[PDB]
C-alpha cells in the first residue's frame, strides 16, 4: 500500500476545501447507473484526475468522475467509474475512495454491480439484494486490509458476518411494493471472482455448489473497508445474464449482453435508488 | 506485465526472419512428449535463449527449445519445455509463447500435461481429454489477462464456457478406435493448482467435491490466452498417478512415479498426437 | 524470495556461535502459549532484532523473541511471536525461521494456533489435533516453496498427504487421559485463510462444505517448509470461538474473545506441551 493516513486526510480536506457539499451517503454506481448523476439536484462534478491521490484509469474509454449533490433530499457523493482487480489495480487503490468518503463523514455506502445468475430462479433484468458475499480472492491473501492496520480507521480483525445491514434490506423490500414492479426483488449471496474472462461450466458448477446466487468482479473489497470504517452498507446486483451451467447449450456469455441489460434497467434502477434515500436513517 | 505489443511483434518477425516454416498448429509438449520432436520431418530447432524476449528457465536442468517442422503433413511449432507458476514465473511470462504463436498465424493449439487422477474410474497410464478446466488461481486474481487489454489480441472479457473445441474431441475419440488401444480414451475436467507440493487428503477431497477429474499445475493459463486470441484449443492429460484420497493408505505421491508414467506412455502419446494432425482442419 | 542459502547458514551459525543450546525440538507458540517460556529451565532469550536476517515485526505491540532451553528434559527452541500473511509478510519471510531451525539440526516441529470451530461438535476451549490441512492460499500460488528449489533443503515436489505424524497424534491422545481432562481431545482438518477480517456466513458454509473442522490464519506455510526439510510435524488448535453459521444469530466474532479463550486455556496448553516432550522420540 503506497498511501499514508496523511495522504487520505489531504484528499478529504482538498474536497472539503473545493465544495460546500457535506455528504452522508456514498453511492458507487455499477452497470446502468451511469445517468443517476442526471437526478442529483445542485450537482458539483470532479474528474478523478483533479482529485488528489485519486487513482485514475489508464484506459482511454472511461474518465471516472466524482459528483456531490442531493438525491431525494439526501446529501450524496456518487462514484461514476469504478476500479477492478482485472484492470490491474491493487486493492489498496480499488478501495482508496471509501476511506476518503469516511473522512468526509459519510456514514452510509450504497454499492451496485452487474452479476451473472447462478441461482436458476433468477432471470435477466432481475435485482438481487446482497445479503452476504463469498470473498474468494480474500481467502488467498487478496484482502484490502492486508498490511499494517491503522486504529484511526478501525480494528485489526473486523467481523463481516453482519456486513449487509438487515434494516436497509427490509426497508428495500417495502420500497419495491411501492414501486409496484411486476417482478419480486430477489435476495442472495454474491461471490466475487477477479476475472476478466467469463466462467467455464465446471467453474459455474463450483460457484453454485459453494452456495453463491450471483457472480461479479467488484464490490466486495469496498464493502470490507466500508465495514472496517464503521459504515452502514447496502448493495444489490443487476442480473445481466444466466451463467451457462451445461455443455449442451451453444451460448457464450458476452460483455455486449451486460451493457444491454444495463441500458435496459437504467430507469428502474435510478428510481429504486432515489426512493431508497428516504429510508436512509439521518 | 513487462511486454509491449512491439515486443511480441519483434519476436514473431525475428522467427519469421530466421525460418521458412509457416506453422498452422502449435503443440506444447507436457510429460512424456519429450521425443515427439524426433517425429518432425524437416526439423529446425531454436533454443529459447536465442529467441528474443523469450523467457529462459534459470534452472540448470532444462534448456527449453522451440522446434519448427511437419508432423503427419501438418506445419507445427512444438514447445519442448514449459513455464510453471511453481517455478516463480508470472503468467505474462508463462503464456508469452502463445501470443507469439498467434502472430506467426498458428490457428490451433494442442496442450498436453501430467495430472493426478481424482476420478476413481481413472488408472495410471490413462489419457483424459480436457473437456473443461477449473482455474482456481484465476478466481483469486492470477489470470493471464489481468491488466490492460490489447484489442489486437482479443476482447477485454472473453468467454471460456466453449474453450475446448467439441469437434476436435469427437475426432479424437474416433482416432482412438483406429489406434485400437486396450483402454478407452477418458474425458473430464482438469483443475489447475499452483503447487509445487502435492495435495493433502482433505485437499484431494476438496478438488473431487468441486467436480474435478484430474489435477495438474499447468495448461490453463495457456488455454485462456489461446482462446483470447481466437485459437482452436484441444488438450489431454496423462494420468501419472491416483491422488491419495484416504488416511489409511501408507503411500505418498512422488515426481519419480510421474517421470516413470511419462517414459512408459511416450510411444502411445507420440502416435496419438501425429495421427491427430490429420483431423486438424486446414 | 530475498534470502540465499548463505543467508540461512549465516543465521544458523550466528545462533550456534551465541548459545551452547543444541535443540532437537522447535515449538511455534500460538494463542495462549505466551508464558510457556516461563517453564523452560536454563532459558537463553534472543530478540528477533539481534538475530541476523530474522524478520522483525514493524508493529510496535509485539517484540518477537526466540528462546533456547530445556522443557521436560527436551532441548527446545521456542518462537514467541509469529509472522502472518495478514501482517503483509511474504511467505519466504513467514517460514524463514523453520529453515534456520533445520540448520540448527532440530528434527521436530510443534505448531500451536487459535482457530474458529466449523465442526458443530466443537466447543470454545477445546483442543483439536491437526490431522490434515486445506491450504487455500497455496492453490492460488501462495505456497512458500514457489520459486527455485534448493536440493540442500529438499525435493522440488514434496508430498504432504502424510504431513502430520500419525505416531505423535496417538501418543498425544494417550497423554490426554494421563492429564485426566474433563473434555475429549479433538482431531480434525485446519483450513488456512489469509484474513485478517473474520468470515461471512456464506464463507463459513463454504469452509464447512469443503470438509474443514477449524479455520485459522497461520501454521500451514510453516508445516509445508518443515515437511520439505524432513522435519516430523505435530500441531493442534485452541478452539477460540464457534464460527457464526446462520443469519438469525445477532453475534459477531471478535479478537477480544480470542485473547480471552487464550488466557483461559494457557495453563492447560502449557501442561499438555511439556508432558508431550517425553513422547518425542530422541
Ligand atoms: C465480464 O464482463 C463484465 C464486466 C464488468 C462487470 C462488472 C462491473 P461492476 O458493475 O461490478 O462495476 C461484470 S459482472 C458480471 C456480469 N455477468 C457475469 C458473469 O457471468 N460472470 C462474472 N461476472 C459477471 C462482467
Ligand atoms: C508435483 O510434480 C509434478 C511436476 C510436474 C507436473 C506437470 C507438468 P506439465 O506436464 O503440466 O507440464 C505435475 S502434474 C501432476 C501429476 N500428478 C499430480 C498430482 O497428484 N497433483 C498435482 N499435480 C500433479 C506434477
Ligand atoms: C481474526 O483474529 C485472529 C487473530 C489471530 C489468529 C491466529 C493467530 P495464531 O494463533 O495462528 O498464531 C486468529 S485464528 C482464528 C480464531 N478464530 C477464527 C475465526 O473465526 N476465523 C478465522 N480465524 C480465526 C484470529
Ligand atoms: Cl498517477
Ligand atoms: Cl496488483
Ligand atoms: Cl496486487
Ligand atoms: Cl532474461
Ligand atoms: Cl510472480
Ligand atoms: Cl505474479
Ligand atoms: Cl529489516
Ligand atoms: Cl507479499
Ligand atoms: Cl507476496
Residue whose CA is closest, atom 16 of ligand 2? B115
Give one word for C75, left, alpha or beta, with left for phi > 0 and alpha for psi -120 to 50: beta
Start-to-end C-alpha separation, chain C: 33
Helices (H), B95-165: 96-103, 136-140
Tell which residue, C32, C14, C33, has the closest CA to residue C76: C33
Q: Does C72 appear as a known binding residue?
A: no
Binding site of B, by residue number, is: 31, 62, 82-84, 86, 114, 199, 217-218, 241, 255
- The residues in A 202-261 lying below 8 A from B, measured between CB atoms, are 202-206, 209, 244, 247, 249, 251-255, 258
Angle between helix C166-179 and C256-276 (nearest 10): 100
Q: How far is A270 from chain B (nearest CA, A)?
A: 26
**How much distance in Å is there from the Cα of A219 to the middle of ligand 4?**
23
- CB-based contact B227:B235 (threshold 8 Å): no
Cα torsion through B69, B71, B76, B81, rounded to 10: -90
- CB-based contact A32:A262 (threshold 8 Å): yes
Atom of ligand 2 nearest to the CA of B258: 16
Residue whose CA is closest, atom 11 of ligand 1? A113
Q: What are phi and psi of B84, to 5 degrees?
A: -120, 145
Residues with CB under 6 A from ligand 1: A 30-31, 82, 113-116, 193, 195-196, 198-199, 215-219, 240-241, 243, 253, 255, 258; B 157
- CB-based contact C39:C274 (threshold 8 Å): yes
Q: How many residues are there in chain B?
A: 282
- CB-based contact C201:C242 (threshold 8 Å): no
Q: How far is B147 from chain A (nearest CA, A)?
A: 4
Indicate if C279 belongs to the active site: no
Question: Which positions ≥6 away from A223 have C-beta within 8 Å?
Answer: A109, A111, A130, A133, A160, A163, A164, A233, A235
Q: Does C59 touch chain A (CB under 8 A)?
A: yes
From C5, C86, C174, C197, active-site residue: C86
Indicate if B140 belongs to the active site: no
Partners of residue A209 in chain B, C-beta under 8 Å: 209-211
Helices (H), chain B: 5-17, 91-94, 96-103, 136-140, 166-179, 201-209, 220-229, 256-276
- CB-based contact B136:C141 (threshold 8 Å): no
- CB-based contact A102:A15 (threshold 8 Å): no
DSSP per-residue codes, B19-45: -----SEEEEE-TT-GGGGGG-EEEEE
Please give the method by which this entry was determined: X-ray
Tell which residue, C35, C110, C143, has the closest CA to residue B86: C143
C30 within ligand 3 shell (Cβ under 6 A): yes
DSSP per-residue codes, C192-254: E---SSPP-HHHHHHHHHTT-SEEESSSHHHHHHHHHHT-EEEEEEEEEEE----SS------
Tell which residue, C234, C250, C208, has the closest CA to residue C121: C208
Contact between A254 and B211 using a beta-carbon 8 Å cutoff: no
Tell which residue, C240, C131, C108, C140, has the closest CA to residue C186: C131
* Other Cβ atoms within 10 Å of C24 Cβ, number: 17
B8 within ligand 2 shell (Cβ under 6 A): no
- CB-based contact A160:C198 (threshold 8 Å): yes
Question: Which positions ≥6 away from A59 have C-beta within 8 Å?
Answer: A87, B148
Tell me how far apart the alpha carbons of residues C273 and C109 are, in angstroms, rounded to a whole number: 12
The resolution in Å comes to 2.7
Active site residues of A: 31, 62, 84, 86-87, 114, 217-218, 241, 255
Q: What are phi and psi of A264, to 5 degrees?
A: -70, -30
DSSP β-ladder status, B74-80 and B65-71: antiparallel
* Other Cβ atoms within 10 Å of A281 Cβ, number: 11
Q: How far is CA C83 from the centre of its chain?
A: 10
- CB-based contact B74:B41 (threshold 8 Å): no
Binding site of B for phosphate, by residue number, is: 31, 62, 82-84, 114, 218
Amino acid at each position: 500500500n503506497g498511501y499514508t493516513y496523511e495522504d487520505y486526510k489531504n484528499t478529504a480536506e482538498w474536497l472539503l476545501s473545493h465544495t460546500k457539499h457535506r455528504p452522508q451517503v456514498a453511492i458507487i454506481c455499477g452497470s446502468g447507473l451511469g445517468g443517476l448523476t442526471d437526478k442529483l439536484t445542485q450537482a458539483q462534478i470532479f474528474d478523478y484526475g483533479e482529485i488528489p491521490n485519486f487513482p485514475r484509469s489508464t484506459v482511454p474509454g472511461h474518465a471516472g468522475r466524482l459528483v456531490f449533490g442531493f438525491l431525494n433530499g439526501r446529501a450524496c457523493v456518487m462514484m461514476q467509474g469504478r476500479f477492478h482487480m482485472y484492470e490491474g489495480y491493487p486493492l489498496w487503490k480499488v478501495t482508496f475512495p471509501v476511506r476518503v468518503f469516511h473522512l468526509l463523514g459519510v456514514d452510509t455506502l450504497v454499492v451496485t454491480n452487474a452479476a451473472g445468475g447462478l441461482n436458476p430462479k433468477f432471470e435477466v433484468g432481475d435485482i438481487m439484494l446482497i445479503r452476504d458475499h463469498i470473498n474468494l480472492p480474500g481467502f488467498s491473501g487478496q484482502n484490502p486490509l492486508r498490511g499494517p492496520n491503522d486504529e484511526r480507521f478501525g480494528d485489526r480483525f473486523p467481523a463481516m458476518s453482519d456486513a449487509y445491514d438487515r434494516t436497509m434490506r427490509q426497508r428495500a423490500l417495502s420500497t419495491w411494493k411501492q414501486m409496484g414492479e411486476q417482478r419480486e426483488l430477489q435476495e442472495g449471496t454474491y461471490v466475487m471472482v477477479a476475472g476478466p474472462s467469463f466462467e467455464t461450466v465446471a467453474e459455474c458448477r463450483v460457484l453454485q455448489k459453494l452456495g453463491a446466487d450471483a457472480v461479479g468482479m467488484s464490490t466486495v473489497p469496498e464493502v470490507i473497508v466500508a465495514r472496517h470504517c464503521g459504515l452502514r452498507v447496502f448493495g444489490f446486483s443487476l442480473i445481466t445474464n444466466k451463467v451457462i451451467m451445461d455443455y449442451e447449450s451453444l451460448e457464450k456469455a458476452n460483455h455486449e449482453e451486460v451493457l444491454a441489460a444495463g441500458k435496459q434497467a437504467a430507469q428502474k434502477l435510478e428510481q429504486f435508488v432515489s426512493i431508497l434515500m428516504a429510508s436512509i436513517p439521518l
